[PDB]
Amino acid sequence: ERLSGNQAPSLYAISLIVVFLCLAALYESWSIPFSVMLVVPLGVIGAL
């Protein structure tokens, strides 16, 4: 359980980084990701 908890911050951080990098690569714009990335807390607020 301790492992599950302690690992989590790193999990989200790298997951968010990946998505960003994927969007940047696919849609050639460097700012397209920025916008869609700001939509994360809009979903997370619901889960909470």
Binding site for a second copy (CB under 8 A): 17, 21-22, 24-25, 28-30
Q: Phi/psi zone of residue 3: left (φ > 0), alpha (ψ -120 to 50 degrees), beta?
A: alpha
Token pair 């911050």 is found at 9
The least CB distance from residue 47 to a second copy, in Å, is 27
Q: Of the two residues 18 and 40, which places its CB atom closer to a second copy in the complex?
A: 18
The C-alpha atoms of residue 20 and residue 12 are separated, in whole angstroms, by 12
Q: Of the two residues 32 and 40, which places its CB atom closer to a second copy in the complex?
A: 32
The least CB distance from residue 34 to a second copy, in Å, is 12
Q: Which one-letter DSSP state was computed for residue 38?
A: T
